Amino acid sequence: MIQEQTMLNVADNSGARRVMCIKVLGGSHRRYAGVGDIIKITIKEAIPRGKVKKGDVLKAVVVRTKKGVRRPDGSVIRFDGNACVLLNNNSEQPIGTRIFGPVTRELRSEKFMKIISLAPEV
Amino acid sequence: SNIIKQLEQEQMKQDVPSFRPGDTVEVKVWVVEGSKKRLQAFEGVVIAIRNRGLHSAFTVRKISNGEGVERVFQTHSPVVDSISVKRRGAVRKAKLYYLRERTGKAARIKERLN
Amino acid sequence: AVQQNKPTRSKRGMRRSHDALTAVTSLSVDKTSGEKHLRHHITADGYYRGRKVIAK
Amino acid sequence: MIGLVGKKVGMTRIFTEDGVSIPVTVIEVEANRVTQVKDLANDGYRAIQVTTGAKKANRVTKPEAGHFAKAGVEAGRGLWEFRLAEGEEFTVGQSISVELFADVKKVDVTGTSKGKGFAGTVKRWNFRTQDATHGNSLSHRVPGSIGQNQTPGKVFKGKKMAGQMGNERVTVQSLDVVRVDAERNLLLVKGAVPGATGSDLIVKPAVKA
Amino acid sequence: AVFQMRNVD
Amino acid sequence: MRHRKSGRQLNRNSSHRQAMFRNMAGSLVRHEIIKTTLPKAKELRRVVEPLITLAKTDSVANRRLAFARTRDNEIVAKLFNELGPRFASRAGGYTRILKCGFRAGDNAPMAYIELVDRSE
RNA sequence: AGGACCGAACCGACUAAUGUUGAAAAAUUAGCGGAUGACUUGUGGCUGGGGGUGAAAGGCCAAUCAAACCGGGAGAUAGCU
RNA sequence: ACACAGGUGGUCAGGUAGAGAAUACCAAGGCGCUUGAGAGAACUCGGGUGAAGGAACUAGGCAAAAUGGUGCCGUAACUUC
RNA sequence: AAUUCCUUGUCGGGUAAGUUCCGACCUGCACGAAUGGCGUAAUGAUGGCCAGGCUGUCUCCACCCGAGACUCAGUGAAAU
RNA sequence: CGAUGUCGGCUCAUCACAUCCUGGGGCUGAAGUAGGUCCCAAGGGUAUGGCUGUUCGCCAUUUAAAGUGGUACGCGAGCUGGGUUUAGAACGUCGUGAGACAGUUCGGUCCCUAUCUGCCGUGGGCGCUGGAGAACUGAGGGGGGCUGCUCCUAGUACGAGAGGACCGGAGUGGACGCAUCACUGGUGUUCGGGUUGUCAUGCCAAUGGCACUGCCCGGUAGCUAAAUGCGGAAGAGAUAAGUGCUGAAAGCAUCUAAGCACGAAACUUGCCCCGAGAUGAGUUCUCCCUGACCCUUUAAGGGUCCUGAAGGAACGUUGAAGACGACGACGUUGAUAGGCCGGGUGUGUAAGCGCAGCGAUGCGUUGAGCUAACCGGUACUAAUGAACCGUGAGGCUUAACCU
Ligand SMILES: CC[C@H]1OC(=O)[C@H](C)[C@@H](O[C@H]2C[C@@](C)(OC)[C@@H](O)[C@H](C)O2)[C@H](C)[C@@H](O[C@@H]2O[C@H](C)C[C@H](N(C)C)[C@H]2O)[C@](C)(O)C[C@@H](C)C(=O)[C@H](C)[C@@H](O)[C@]1(C)O
């Protein structure tokens, strides 16, 4: 259940460490976001040799949420912490060469195929 | 009332093994992969059982590649398959939310051995 | 939060119209002693539906 | 076409072969019978009056009991009217059944909402609460301003305000139906429906396409 | 209590 | 909005409800009959009777479970040893309500409550 | 050793709520400052109105102070309501 | 001005825990505070908890929350050491 | 600048974005040396800003425990 | 001026159209995509933040778009007191001075129990012409009316390439409304367990009281969103701008003057709710009442005796109904409430005993004990027989019928 001013763990080797959801993309007066919805984010922290640096702002896709992703059977897959992969701001597609952690099944949506191609679990 | 319970019991499966909370329990899960309906395993210690007749379900945590991954499962849902108990065990207090903070060696559970 | 003018006694009386009491008129003779008493209530002598109880 | 009277029993679910869990609300529907057929002649419009259930033989009033006696049949717990589909022509006393719901596809489920009792503006119209602090005093869930000044100088009619909530007729539209078990008189409409458990209901075919 | 204050409009 | 709730707050905190009923339940036992306000008596009916149901079968544990309530050895002594067998086959209905007019002190609805037998 | 430290009694009254025809003509509740000293307090005196006193706010001088209160000049004056 | 949640100096100093006259439970002893009985709506006051986020509220981290003990390890810029 | 009207001076730092803050430039409307200038460890229920932790402050309120509100009985005001 | 509280913010809005977005068109220096400009159209919708007390403004990033204004520059008997705007103080400047400055900075009590109008709800009374029980007809009124993205058509029309549709169809979200607890969660001081200090039950053991429910860990019902179902429409009617057909005045021409056809989220309906106090008080079905004499100003007259029906009310048990009334259900030919029996659920191995150990503790008995508000059964108890209210055939006039 991502919202404005929400810190998130980085989900890939983009070199970023901590991020924050400054804005929630996708519709007027929108509040909550998650599952796989795009959210533009600032980079509050990054490792020195990473592709990205501190203060960078770019769109990124949520991959994990504490609320978890719901399923038609009623089952839900909760996670200990939020995470997101840093898509390129210009035309999607992840920047990192390796996405850590088990991406959820809901990512299956053409454009996110590159992300789920990595990380053997789920 | 009885019209409800009769409707519920008919849909209930009769092949559910008993299991104590805190036991390690694999949970097979059928899932579409965009085509083939391959089954997938999901082993993990139980932390929260919730019996509600047909509505009964149980949480299953699994600490993988860093942060843990809890997953609830309906007992009677078609999606779930075998519910084997890979490891006998026992803990006081059926709820185990406190384990969510505990990690590594703190996550140990003694075998019931009886 | 206060009147700008003084109400007529008529307006006060119309307000008093709903204040009137109504007699219950539900008294009933005892099956045994025959003394009147309120329905679903025991007699002062303690009799109730003809059986003896309380006795005080 | 005509609707039928039903009765809520309790929300449940029906598992499907694909593993999807679709919620449903059990609604028993004893077969209706036409106590009287309204028409353009004697009544000025064509319609049917119907009833269901078994009211106690002692508690039924004679003025009603004769109205059921005209139908020649034992009194129901209540009475409800349904408009004719014009092309329909039903005989008096006919035992209409739940089987008609086999082809309805989608239905609206009329019912009475739960009595929330008297309630504030927040519970009733979802008004946001004011500041809980910052010097605030005796003002939180209160409606606050309800008008301008000397212009109008009166609250507008129909203004959103605190008052009685629930306990009124309502009808969710285009609810899906799943099973139609005539043997048990079941009516497993998809999703939640208005009304307390055990309350009377009025299921009708959806006007929506 | 009556108070005091002023009316500097 | 209540809805399917049971019991009554009776303008008192639960800590007081755990004590006043605890004493009044013993008071009803000691004299086999007491005068009290009707709503409080209806509350009392759900209190005293279960103790009798506990008194239906003597055991070392039930004496202590009874001891946790009422907190009076003199009352539980009347339990099991006397009040237990006396109801015998009967199931429920251990006590009855009988309203006795309104109190003079503030028009409070008075109502006597008493055991089915009364043999003292 | 200390106009030293934390912290009750004691003293003080920074914040906020409640109260605003209040329980109270300035309080209560939850926190706060000082607490061996330029400390606090009991008891009894001293400074009396253009004066007193003041680590100074023109504050305080019996719930009133850019001049207390009581009585008197006095039915002061008022081109004002 | 009240049978008023205010103000009023000194003296007597039990048990257990505790550094303590803090505080909790108790002894001696004194009280349940001069309107009650119900119902369990908003709203208001005094509190508890809350999933996701953690100042995005707001004039302002206001208010709540949080930190909290003893023993020990260890502790920077700066300095009138 | 507790002082600068122009003014949100300009530049740099902090933030995704900073009329506030820090540093500097001096074009000081209208700084200035006992009506004291500048600097300063410690001290502060002092002013402004940032951050960690913390949280219903908020997104958005939800439920529960008590005191009123409500009804009955007793007594019985107020401004206007 | 014998007082009209004064900027902004919070909350809550309402109206206007000189229309921000969506809709319908004209023209274009309109290829398409996307624009310019103008007309019609107010149904709905019409940003979060950073700075500043600010509206405004700038910046960051969204969005189909982040409209312009009225409403005492809306709204303090609704809130906030940051600004301004008292009494303290300081800086700059002015004056010999006290002081002053739409110059600046720090700090600074926001009262009122609703009489009427108005509004949100809920009742009593009476009328609707004999009384009563239900089903109603719908005059009228309110509510709802937003829209992206993607796919098919189609990489087709168009175009040099690049790009990329008009019409129509399908799917899925954002915002909003309603309903619901079945799931996922929260609350759950009435359920169970852990544990700290102390007191008490004579003590061992076992329990209880108090300390915010002592601190907590959970957790039934109920309630509730963050949870899941549905809703905006399609169609039709008459139109606005607009596109026309025929056709004279005016041999031609012309959408119009006669006539005729299309045309929008606006209008009238359809959709949902209220609703015959709709005094213009309507219909339909059913039920109940078929006794004897005087008085008076002699009639819609005043009473007595005999009668008291349908039904209602009162009382009691009550309710997922409720502030009080009301409303639904039950009241002995009986499941309304409590209890009870069984079950479920929560808590997770009671008490006691035995065994192992020097001991704290463990094991066995044992998924045991305890279970509130749940479910299925049960008349054990509490809902007494009655009495009360309400009557005794229901005006005049006219017409149509009683074949
Ligand atoms: C405790 C109770 C007191 O109330 C208050 O404290 C509130 C908070 C004041 O506002 C305070 C605070 C403040 C800012 O007003 C909120 C200020 O403006 C006034 C001067 O004093 C009031 C109401 C003032 O009225 C205001 O008078 C203004 C001149 C006009 C205004 N009216 C036109 C709207 C009116 O409301 C004023 C002067 O005190 C009223 C006079 C009659 C009093 O002195 C009376 C005896 C007060 O002691 C009091 C009412 O009992």
Short mmCIF file of N, CA and C (backbone and C1' of nucleotides) in Angstrom, two decimals, chain J residues 204-227:
data_model
loop_
_atom_site.label_atom_id
_atom_site.label_comp_id
_atom_site.label_asym_id
_atom_site.label_seq_id
_atom_site.Cartn_x
_atom_site.Cartn_y
_atom_site.Cartn_z
P C J 204 1.72 -20.69 51.71
"O5'" C J 204 1.95 -22.23 51.37
"C5'" C J 204 3.17 -22.88 51.70
"C4'" C J 204 3.19 -24.31 51.22
"C3'" C J 204 2.75 -24.52 49.77
"O3'" C J 204 3.78 -24.27 48.84
"C1'" C J 204 1.64 -26.07 51.17
P A J 205 3.56 -23.18 47.67
"O5'" A J 205 2.41 -23.81 46.77
"C5'" A J 205 2.65 -24.96 45.98
"C4'" A J 205 1.38 -25.73 45.72
"C3'" A J 205 0.35 -25.05 44.82
"O3'" A J 205 0.64 -25.20 43.44
"C1'" A J 205 -0.73 -25.85 46.76
P A J 206 0.46 -23.96 42.44
"O5'" A J 206 -1.11 -23.67 42.46
"C5'" A J 206 -2.03 -24.59 41.89
"C4'" A J 206 -3.43 -24.36 42.39
"C3'" A J 206 -4.12 -23.09 41.90
"O3'" A J 206 -4.68 -23.23 40.61
"C1'" A J 206 -4.38 -23.26 44.24
P U J 207 -4.94 -21.93 39.70
"O5'" U J 207 -6.19 -21.23 40.39
"C5'" U J 207 -6.51 -19.87 40.14
"C4'" U J 207 -7.46 -19.32 41.17
"C3'" U J 207 -7.69 -17.82 41.13
"O3'" U J 207 -8.62 -17.43 40.14
"C1'" U J 207 -7.27 -18.50 43.35
P G J 208 -8.39 -16.08 39.30
"O5'" G J 208 -8.86 -14.92 40.29
"C5'" G J 208 -10.20 -14.89 40.77
"C4'" G J 208 -10.32 -14.04 42.02
"C3'" G J 208 -9.84 -12.60 41.90
"O3'" G J 208 -10.79 -11.75 41.28
"C1'" G J 208 -8.96 -13.55 43.87
P G J 209 -10.30 -10.43 40.50
"O5'" G J 209 -9.92 -9.41 41.67
"C5'" G J 209 -10.90 -8.97 42.60
"C4'" G J 209 -10.32 -8.01 43.60
"C3'" G J 209 -9.48 -6.87 43.02
"O3'" G J 209 -10.28 -5.81 42.52
"C1'" G J 209 -8.35 -7.83 44.86
P C J 210 -9.89 -5.11 41.13
"O5'" C J 210 -8.70 -4.13 41.52
"C5'" C J 210 -8.86 -3.16 42.55
"C4'" C J 210 -7.54 -2.62 43.02
"C3'" C J 210 -6.60 -2.12 41.94
"O3'" C J 210 -6.92 -0.81 41.49
"C1'" C J 210 -5.40 -3.49 43.44
P A J 211 -6.88 -0.46 39.92
"O5'" A J 211 -5.35 -0.14 39.64
"C5'" A J 211 -4.72 0.98 40.23
"C4'" A J 211 -3.23 0.79 40.35
"C3'" A J 211 -2.47 0.64 39.04
"O3'" A J 211 -2.22 1.88 38.41
"C1'" A J 211 -1.73 -1.00 40.59
P C J 212 -2.05 1.97 36.81
"O5'" C J 212 -3.49 1.61 36.25
"C5'" C J 212 -4.59 2.50 36.43
"C4'" C J 212 -5.28 2.83 35.13
"C3'" C J 212 -5.81 1.63 34.34
"O3'" C J 212 -7.01 2.00 33.67
"C1'" C J 212 -4.25 2.81 33.02
P U J 213 -8.44 1.59 34.27
"O5'" U J 213 -8.45 0.00 34.22
"C5'" U J 213 -8.68 -0.70 33.00
"C4'" U J 213 -8.47 -2.18 33.16
"C3'" U J 213 -7.03 -2.61 33.40
"O3'" U J 213 -7.01 -3.73 34.29
"C1'" U J 213 -7.84 -3.65 31.45
P G J 214 -6.39 -3.58 35.76
"O5'" G J 214 -4.87 -3.18 35.50
"C5'" G J 214 -4.37 -1.92 35.90
"C4'" G J 214 -2.86 -1.90 35.89
"C3'" G J 214 -2.20 -2.21 34.56
"O3'" G J 214 -2.14 -1.09 33.70
"C1'" G J 214 -1.17 -3.49 36.25
P C J 215 -2.26 -1.28 32.10
"O5'" C J 215 -0.91 -2.04 31.70
"C5'" C J 215 0.35 -1.43 31.88
"C4'" C J 215 1.48 -2.42 31.67
"C3'" C J 215 1.52 -3.08 30.30
"O3'" C J 215 2.12 -2.26 29.31
"C1'" C J 215 1.79 -4.72 31.98
P C J 216 1.55 -2.29 27.80
"O5'" C J 216 0.54 -3.51 27.81
"C5'" C J 216 0.33 -4.29 26.64
"C4'" C J 216 1.04 -5.62 26.74
"C3'" C J 216 0.67 -6.65 25.68
"O3'" C J 216 1.35 -6.45 24.45
"C1'" C J 216 0.64 -7.67 27.81
P C J 217 0.60 -6.70 23.06
"O5'" C J 217 0.53 -8.29 22.95
"C5'" C J 217 1.71 -9.07 22.95
"C4'" C J 217 1.40 -10.54 22.91
"C3'" C J 217 0.34 -10.96 21.91
"O3'" C J 217 0.83 -11.07 20.59
"C1'" C J 217 -0.08 -12.00 23.99
P G J 218 -0.06 -10.59 19.35
"O5'" G J 218 -1.55 -10.84 19.84
"C5'" G J 218 -2.53 -11.39 18.96
"C4'" G J 218 -3.05 -12.71 19.48
"C3'" G J 218 -4.48 -13.06 19.10
"O3'" G J 218 -4.57 -13.61 17.80
"C1'" G J 218 -4.18 -13.41 21.41
P G J 219 -5.53 -12.94 16.70
"O5'" G J 219 -7.00 -13.33 17.18
"C5'" G J 219 -7.38 -14.69 17.31
"C4'" G J 219 -8.53 -14.85 18.28
"C3'" G J 219 -9.77 -14.03 17.98
"O3'" G J 219 -10.60 -14.63 17.00
"C1'" G J 219 -9.21 -13.80 20.26
P U J 220 -11.79 -13.79 16.31
"O5'" U J 220 -13.10 -14.32 17.04
"C5'" U J 220 -13.46 -15.69 16.99
"C4'" U J 220 -14.83 -15.93 17.59
"C3'" U J 220 -15.95 -15.05 17.08
"O3'" U J 220 -16.48 -15.48 15.84
"C1'" U J 220 -16.03 -15.14 19.43
P A J 221 -16.80 -14.42 14.68
"O5'" A J 221 -18.14 -13.70 15.17
"C5'" A J 221 -19.36 -14.42 15.26
"C4'" A J 221 -20.33 -13.74 16.18
"C3'" A J 221 -20.83 -12.37 15.74
"O3'" A J 221 -21.89 -12.44 14.80
"C1'" A J 221 -20.15 -12.26 17.99
P G J 222 -21.86 -11.52 13.48
"O5'" G J 222 -22.01 -10.04 14.04
"C5'" G J 222 -23.18 -9.63 14.73
"C4'" G J 222 -22.95 -8.35 15.50
"C3'" G J 222 -22.46 -7.16 14.69
"O3'" G J 222 -23.50 -6.48 14.02
"C1'" G J 222 -21.11 -7.40 16.62
P C J 223 -23.31 -6.00 12.50
"O5'" C J 223 -22.38 -4.72 12.61
"C5'" C J 223 -22.80 -3.57 13.34
"C4'" C J 223 -21.64 -2.69 13.72
"C3'" C J 223 -20.79 -2.17 12.57
"O3'" C J 223 -21.35 -1.03 11.94
"C1'" C J 223 -19.38 -3.05 14.25
P U J 224 -21.27 -0.87 10.34
"O5'" U J 224 -19.72 -0.62 10.06
"C5'" U J 224 -19.06 0.54 10.56
"C4'" U J 224 -17.56 0.41 10.46
"C3'" U J 224 -17.00 0.17 9.06
"O3'" U J 224 -16.87 1.36 8.31
"C1'" U J 224 -16.02 -1.36 10.58
P A J 225 -16.81 1.30 6.71
"O5'" A J 225 -15.26 1.12 6.39
"C5'" A J 225 -14.32 2.16 6.69
"C4'" A J 225 -12.91 1.73 6.41
"C3'" A J 225 -12.49 1.81 4.94
"O3'" A J 225 -11.09 2.09 4.86
"C1'" A J 225 -12.35 -0.43 5.68
P A J 226 -10.57 3.34 3.99
"O5'" A J 226 -9.35 2.75 3.15
"C5'" A J 226 -9.56 1.74 2.17
"C4'" A J 226 -8.46 0.71 2.18
"C3'" A J 226 -8.93 -0.74 2.01
"O3'" A J 226 -7.95 -1.47 1.26
"C1'" A J 226 -7.77 -0.53 4.05
P A J 227 -8.35 -2.18 -0.12
"O5'" A J 227 -9.17 -3.47 0.33
"C5'" A J 227 -8.53 -4.54 1.01
"C4'" A J 227 -9.52 -5.60 1.43
"C3'" A J 227 -10.60 -5.94 0.41
"O3'" A J 227 -10.14 -6.81 -0.61
"C1'" A J 227 -11.58 -5.69 2.55
#
